[PDB]
């Protein structure tokens, strides 16, 4: 019955007092009763051995009432024998004690799930940082649908930060002491019976190739329990993607997902390089966010806080749209329904297809995506007619039912080329006359870990671009560092490795940042170690250098930052409080900054929206096939091939980019048009979709606008983030 | 008076599970359904408005009991008879709304409020009924005040997890303590069924509770004591109880106490006095030489307060040095990044600022750019 040794030993120790508080009554009762021989049996008083007990217990507990007493000289003697032996008995075994009920599990258990009520679990590196993101974007305020309750599932125990943030959200949040290997930590919390999991996988780490390997167990053992469940993964390389392929109950078409980090955060910072402002657009699209126009707010803070609002929503279309080309369906969403459209789910195995031509057209039953204020104005696309809903002003009345190249053939490829062709020194890169340009300052040791330069690359190479378009990158750093690199980004044409440090000017002076597209940032080294807030200063001292340098200010930059409120410190006309979240500050605005935290919210909208992550990959990526995962996974690398005619097709596919409205055709609308009048002459005509705009700060920073109302003035200095088709 | 009111009490939890158990045998060998089922979870919740306001009543309600029983213990069909009935018909409907919003049936029915029900409800009707009054067990409400960090974390005055610890540990000391002595209040003055009532002394409420708390206290005055052998029993068991339950907790009360910011607050500024901050590596070797040629004796000027704000706890060599040089220096815990610890310090009203840096060091490179 007793098994464990913490209950042996407590057990033993319960029957000792017992037996002693017994017995040594039974000695009382004896020397009390009996009187003494030295008196000759003269005092003699009478106790029961019920009465006796209530004597012994009170003066072992050191209490001390004097309600009984001992008069007989035998009685007192045994007495203070007893106080002298139980004082020296009982607090030699209390630290013994105290090791037995002190050393205990202070979570455990089992959930306990009420009757039609959905639960998630959680697993992996769950600490303070990564779950306070992660349970904002879970449990945000401004959100209707049920509170599905968050089950996390770690092994040790949680700190003091943690474990108050766990006792805040006390009705949604659940915690469990037991790792995800153990098949009695599974049945515990009734994963079967549960909804989905989630992987959130350690992002700063000194061996990210082990860390994916445990997360990858971690999936094995939780598919091997159940074999249909939801699971999701954070990655840090994305070459492990390969090994998800590898178990055989993984199915991409029935839920499961896998969130690289490499893959997304040098992808939003790549399509900044050819559009600038575009990470924060789409950071602030799928996100979750709070509208709030208070009346202290200025007027271009107040329009961008109804742009972060607006947010991505799926669902069917009506009959009316059967057998119309895309650009003839989306004129009829943004003027009656007053929606924008960005894609539809082209059947064939189906796939996503962003703003196609107009020779595809629609069939029944097929999936919109939209960017509107909420869900509840998505329905107005179900709830349409021709006939019906014809000459309707007021849009909300509108409810009624009865009415060369790759093996792929998708980015440019070059020969193997060894590292010392396109390296060089200061002269040489002087020599070159380079303008518009990408630059990449590259903060790392020769003992570091990899990020993976080759995502940021990828997507700039794209075979949508021409050759003569694309921009030429100049990575800056240190040279042990990007031999290790090497071997993925050799085949890729234009680059050039500079190295030394960058904050030696004359590096930069020679790369010319004068003339530049786009200045990045990006450190490598071991962060999150040793300080909180002193992570980025090699960072922030960079944009601060190159700020200050001037030649015969006004620069392209962006920033990787791995905590939120090292945000401060960047801008000089800071006119906000440090309380302010960062969605609200000056630069994340302008798109000079950009968090590594917001790859975290994503892990939330992969789980809601189902096409949520695959739609991010299309906009990010260029073209990101599973092709490419299974060809990469082999070790050969990217495969050469100048290709056929029909692989060559697939490069006419949609873009990101930016257009002003100083010169050209739509420069008639940015003397005092609308934004809807561009909308439907840009649409018509050309076959272009606008997103949104980005606008100086006043009358070189520049705020972001994504989907504005019809009813919007359009400046002569302006700008337009714009999906073109050629 | 013992057993008639007791009896009757009885019978509501004697029968009751009879229905249960008969009603679960034919589940085993073998709208009005679940309209109400769903309502009755969706009223009773804490996340709806009403489930905070019908349970914030409870909380009110139940006390409302309890300061009878005060009042009608120290004086020993009136008035206030009437008011505590009228409370106990709330709490009945209460008790039905649960038994069909909670799914267990024979688990629900041994429950800690649930017992409180069955004892407390059934004499008050049958102290109207029979006419004459009965202290009973009125003092089991005290037992419904352990809901008040409920309340509060809900409300978030509570907000840390050592506050909210703290605050917990508070209501269950107090409840305890005063229903123990309604306890030993029944046992001392009714007497007892071996001896058939021969001894019975008498004791009120508020002077049972002194001797309680001496017995807790282990102070052990001998000036109040149990003659009786049912008081001296619980006596044995109160004392047996309290030193495993409270000896368990006291550790987990010492890390609440003893895990604390020892330094911390605020910079107060005297009218007209200037103050310099001091930042980066401050430890007894850099202070030292630092203070001395600050604060040397053969100075003619204005003693200029120096305000440290280093955010690890200092040695116990500095200590002293800050504590010695107590009217000319300050000292606080908190970096120079956050804009609290800069705010409290007023360094916009402050004069200058200095940065003191560590010269023996293993990167001198990193160290300056922190």
């Not at chain 1, 694309?470 to 800056?476: A, E, G, N, R, S």
């Amino acid at each position: 019955v007793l098994k464990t040794s913490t209950l042996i030993r407590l057990v033993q120790l319960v029957v000792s007092f017992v037996s002693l508080w017994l017995t040594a009554a039974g000695f009382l009762h004896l020397l009390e009763n009996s009187g003494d021989p030295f008196f000759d049996f003269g005092n003699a008083q009478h106790l029961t051995y019920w009465e006796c007990l209530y004597f012994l217990m009170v003066t072992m507990s050191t209490v001390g009432f004097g309600d009984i007493f001992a008069t007989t000289v035998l009685g007192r003697t045994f007495v203070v024998i007893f106080i002298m032996i139980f004082i020296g008995l009982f607090a030699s075994f209390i630290p013994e004690i105290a090791e037995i009920l002190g050393k205990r599990q202070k979570y455990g258990g089992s959930y306990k799930k009420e009757r039609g009520k959905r639960h998630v679990v959680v697993c992996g590196y769950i600490t303070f940082d990564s779950v306070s993101n992660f349970l904002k974007d879970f449990l945000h305020k401004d959100r209707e649908d049920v509170d599905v309750e968050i089950v996390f599932l770690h092994k040790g125990l949680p700190g003091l930060e943690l474990e108050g943030l766990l006792k805040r959200h006390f009705t949604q949040v659940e915690y469990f002491w037991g790792s995800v290997m153990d098949a009695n930590d599974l049945e515990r919390v009734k994963i079967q019976e549960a909804d989905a999991c989630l992987v959130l996988a350690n992002k700063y780490c000194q061996d990210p190739d082990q860390e994916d390997a445990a997360n990858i167990m971690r999936v094995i053992s939780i598919k091997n329990y159940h074999s249909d469940i939801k699971v999701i993964v954070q990655l840090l390389q994305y070459h492990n993607k390969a090994y998800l392929l590898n178990i055989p109950s993984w199915d991409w078409k029935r839920g499961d997902d896998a969130v690289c980090v490499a893959e997304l955060k040098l992808g939003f910072i790549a399509q900044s390089c050819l559009a600038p402002g575009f990470s924060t657009l789409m950071a602030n699209l799928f996100t979750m966010r709070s509208y709030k126009p208070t009346p202290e707010m200025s007027q271009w803070q107040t329009d961008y806080m109804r742009g972060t609002g607006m947010e991505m929503y799926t669902e069917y279309l009506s009959s009316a749209f059967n057998a119309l080309t895309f650009p003839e369906a989306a004129e009829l969403c943004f003027s009656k329904l007053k929606l924008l459209l960005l894609a539809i789910e082209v059947r064939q195995e189906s796939t996503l297809a962003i703003n196609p031509g107009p020779k595809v057209k629609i069939e029944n039953a097929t999936q919109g995506f939209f960017i509107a204020e909420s869900a509840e104005e998505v329905k107005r696309a179900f709830y349409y007619c021709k006939n019906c809903h014809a000459n309707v002003s007021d849009v909300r009345q509108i409810k009624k039912c009865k009415c060369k190249f790759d093996s792929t053939g998708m980015f440019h490829w070059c020969p193997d080329r060894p590292l010392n062709d396109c390296l060089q020194d200061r002269s040489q890169a002087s020599a070159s006359g380079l303008r518009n340009h990408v630059v990449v300052c590259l903060f790392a040791d020769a003992a570091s870990p990899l990020i993976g330069l080759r995502n940021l690359v990828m997507p700039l190479r794209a075979s949508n671009f021409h050759y003569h378009e694309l921009k030429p990158t100049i990575i800056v750093g240190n040279l042990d560092y990007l031999h290790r690199e090497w071997k993925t980004l050799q085949n890729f044409p234009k680059l050039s490795i500079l190295p030394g440090s960058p904050l030696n000017r004359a590096n930069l002076r020679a790369v010319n940042i004068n003339l530049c597209d786009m200045c990045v940032i990006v450190s490598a080294k071991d962060r999150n170690m040793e300080d909180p807030n002193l992570v980025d200063k090699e960072a922030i001292l960079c944009s601060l250098n190159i700020k200050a340098m001037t030649f015969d200010a006004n620069v392209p930059l962006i920033t990787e930052l791995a905590n939120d409120s090292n945000v401060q410190f960047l801008d000089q006309d800071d006119d906000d409080d440090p309380d302010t979240e960062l969605y609200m500050t000056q630069p994340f605005a302008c798109g000079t900054a950009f968090a590594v935290s917001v790859l975290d919210s994503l892990m939330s909208t992969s789980y809601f929206n189902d096409n949520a992550l695959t739609l991010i990959r299309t906009l990010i990526t260029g073209g990101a096939t599973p092709e490419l995962e299974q060809i990469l996974a082999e070790g050969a690398g990217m495969r050469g091939g100048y290709c056929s005619p029909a692989v060559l097709a697939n490069r006419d596919r949609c873009r990101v980019a930016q257009i002003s409205l100083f010169d050209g055709p739509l420069a008639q609308f940015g003397q005092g048009g609308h934004y809807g009048e561009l909308f439907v002459y840009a649409l018509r005509h050309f076959g272009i979709l606008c997103i949104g705009l980005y606008r100086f700060r006043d009358t070189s920073k520049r705020y972001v606008i994504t989907n504005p109302p019809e009813d919007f003035p359009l400046l002569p200095t302006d700008q337009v983030y714009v999906l073109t088709y050629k | 008076q013992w057993y008639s009111f007791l009896a009757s009490s009885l019978v509501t939890f004697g029968s009751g599970l009879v229905v249960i158990i008969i009603y679960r045998i034919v589940l085993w060998l073998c709208g009005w359904m679940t309209e109400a089922k769903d309502w009755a979870g969706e009223l009773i919740s804490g996340q709806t408005t009403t489930g905070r306001i019908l349970v914030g009543l409870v909380f009110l309600l139940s006390i409302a009991s309890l300061i009878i029983y005060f009042i009608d213990a120290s004086t020993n069909s009136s008035t206030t008879q009437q008011v505590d009935l009228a409370f106990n018909v709330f709490f009945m409907i209460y008790f039905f709304i649960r038994f069909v919003a909670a799914n267990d049936k024979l688990w629900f029915w041994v429950e800690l409020f649930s017992f409180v029900d069955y004892f407390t409800i059934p004499p008050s009707f049958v102290a109207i009924y029979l006419d004459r009054n009965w202290l009973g067990l009125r003092f089991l409400r005290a037992l419904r005040l352990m809901s008040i960090p409920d309340i509060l974390t809900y409300l978030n005055v509570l907000k840390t997890s050592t506050l909210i610890r703290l605050v917990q540990l508070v209501v269950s000391f107090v409840s305890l303590w005063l229903t123990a002595a309604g306890f030993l209040h029944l046992l001392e003055n009714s007497g007892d069924p071996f001896f058939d009532f021969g001894n019975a002394q008498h004791l009120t409420y508020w002077e049972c509770l002194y001797f309680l708390m001496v017995t807790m206290s282990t102070v052990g005055f001998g000036d109040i004591f149990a003659t009786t052998v049912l008081g001296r029993t619980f006596v044995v068991i109160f004392i047996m109880i309290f030193i495993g339950l409270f000896a368990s907790f006291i550790p987990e009360i010492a890390e609440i106490l003893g895990k604390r910011q020892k330094y911390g607050g605020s910079y107060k500024k005297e009218r007209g006095k200037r103050h310099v901050v001091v930042c980066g590596y401050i430890t007894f070797d850099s202070v030292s030489n630092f203070l001395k040629d600050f604060l040397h004796k053969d100075r003619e000027d204005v003693d200029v307060e120096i305000v440290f704000l280093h955010k690890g706890l200092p040695g116990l060599e500095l200590e002293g040095l800050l504590k010695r040089h107590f009217t000319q220096v300050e000292y606080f815990w908190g970096s120079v990044m956050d804009a609290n610890d800069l705010e409290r310090v007023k360094i916009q009203e402050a004069d200058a600022c200095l940065v003191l840096a560590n010269k023996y060091c293993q990167d001198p490179d990193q160290e300056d750019a922190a």
